[PDB]
Amino acid sequence: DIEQLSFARGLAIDETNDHQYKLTYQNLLPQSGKPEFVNVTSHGKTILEAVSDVSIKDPPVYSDHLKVILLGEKLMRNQNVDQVLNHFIRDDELRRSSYLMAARGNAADVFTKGNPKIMIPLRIGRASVYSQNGYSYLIQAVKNEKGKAKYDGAGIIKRGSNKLVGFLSADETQTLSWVMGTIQGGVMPTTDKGHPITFEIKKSKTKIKPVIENGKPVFHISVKTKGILTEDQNFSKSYLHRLENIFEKKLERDVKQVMDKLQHEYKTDPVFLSDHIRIQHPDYWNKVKGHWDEIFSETDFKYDISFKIIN
Numbered sequence: 001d002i003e004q005l006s007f008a009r010g011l012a013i014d015e016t017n018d019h020q021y022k023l024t025y026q027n028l029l030p031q032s033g034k035p036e037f038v039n040v041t042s043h044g045k046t047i048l049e050a051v052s053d054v055s056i057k058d059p060p061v062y063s064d065h066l067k068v069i070l071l072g073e074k075l076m077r078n079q080n081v082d083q084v085l086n087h088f089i090r091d092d093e094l095r096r097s098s099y100l101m102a103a104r105g106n107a108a109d110v111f112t113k114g115n116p117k118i119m120i121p122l123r124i125g126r127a128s129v130y131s132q133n134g135y136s137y138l139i140q141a142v143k144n145e146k147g148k149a150k151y152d153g154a155g156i157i158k159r160g161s162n163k164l165v166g167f168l169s170a171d172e173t174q175t176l177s178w179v180m181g182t183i184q185g186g187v188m189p190t191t192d193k194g195h196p197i198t199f200e201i202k203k204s205k206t207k208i209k210p211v212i213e214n215g216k217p218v219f220h221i222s223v224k225t226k227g228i229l230t231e232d233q234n235f236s237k238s239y240l241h242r243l244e245n246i247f248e249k250k251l252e253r254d255v256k257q258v259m260d261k262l263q264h265e266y267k268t269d270p271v272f273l274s275d276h277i278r279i280q281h282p283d284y285w286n287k288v289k290g291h292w293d294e295i296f297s298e299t300d301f302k303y304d305i306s307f308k309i310i311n
């Protein structure tokens with residue numbers, strides 16, 4: 001859509017009736033005894049801020065940087081996030097280590113006045129490099145659950161557009177992270193014949209072996225996890241092998257559901273599976289590079305999950 005032209009900028013600075021500063025920028029109307037500069041094509045941005053007499057009097061002595069940037073859902077769904085950050089944030093407001101996060105719903109509502117991970121956490125350094133290099137990726141999500149902020153899964157940012165195409169739940173994010181080997185800790189609660197059993201992760205490792213057969217890739221994923229157990233009803237021997245099997249099968253069916261959403265609902269690989277075929281199969285990679293998501297959707301997965309209780 002076409003907007004009216006303006007080549008010069010002006011600024012109004014006011015103090016309002018409810019005591020706050022209001023800066024209204026102005027897009028000055030191009031001119032061909034009256035005050036001509038007053039005419040605008042449109043008003044520009046407005047800045048609202050409460051500032052104390054002491055803060056007008058005492059200027060800042062150094063340039064600080066943003067620690068965390070939280071992006072609202074509607075913004076991420078409609079706009080290239082890299083382009084947005086570039087447009088609104090000066091490079092010197094950010095550091096490599098500044099955190100980037102996603103909000104379900106409105107981001108401003110997630111920040112709340114005081115009382116009295118792991119995704120991964122994504123830092124600006126990495127997120128920007130992902131965007132620039134055509135990678136889909138995950139960003140930790142937060143939600144104001146009435147509220148009370150709370151970590152709540154992950155946003156899925158798709159390559160090219162750099163837009164959020166959906167969210168994974170906390171459980172789905174844990175499952176995906178577990179199978180991919182990026183998980184640090186966590187618990188899997190389930191049941192054995194109705195009795196609650198929980199498996200707490202101590203150490204987990206994943207090996208991924210992609211094999212092309214034929215024209216499409218087949219990812220052989222191996223998951224080895226050691227953990228602690230919690231019980232109800234009430235040692236072993238085969239009984240631990242039995243519980244291990246229950247936990248193993250659960251992870252498998254849970255990851256199948258998540259992978260199905262990635263392949264056929266969202267149609268993107270936000271966990272760098274692409275990198276494994278790049279290392280193991282450069283020639284094949286060279287041919288598919290330009291349409292990896294298409295290939296990802298057609299890809300098959302074979303899991304080998306092995307749990308070990310040490311409690």
Ligand SMILES: [Cl-]
Nearest residue numbers: 002003004042
């Ligand atoms: Cl206009």
Ligand SMILES: [Cl-]
Nearest residue numbers: 011025045047
């Ligand atoms: Cl400005």
Ligand SMILES: [Cl-]
Nearest residue numbers: 050051052053
């Ligand atoms: Cl104030």
Ligand SMILES: [Cl-]
Nearest residue numbers: 060061062064
């Ligand atoms: Cl300061």
Ligand SMILES: [Cl-]
Nearest residue numbers: 073074075077
């Ligand atoms: Cl929305």
Ligand SMILES: [Cl-]
Nearest residue numbers: 096123125126
């Ligand atoms: Cl890092």
Ligand SMILES: [Cl-]
Nearest residue numbers: 165166265266
């Ligand atoms: Cl959808």
Ligand SMILES: [Cl-]
Nearest residue numbers: 126271272275
């Ligand atoms: Cl990575």
Ligand SMILES: [Cl-]
Nearest residue numbers: 287289290291
């Ligand atoms: Cl191509």
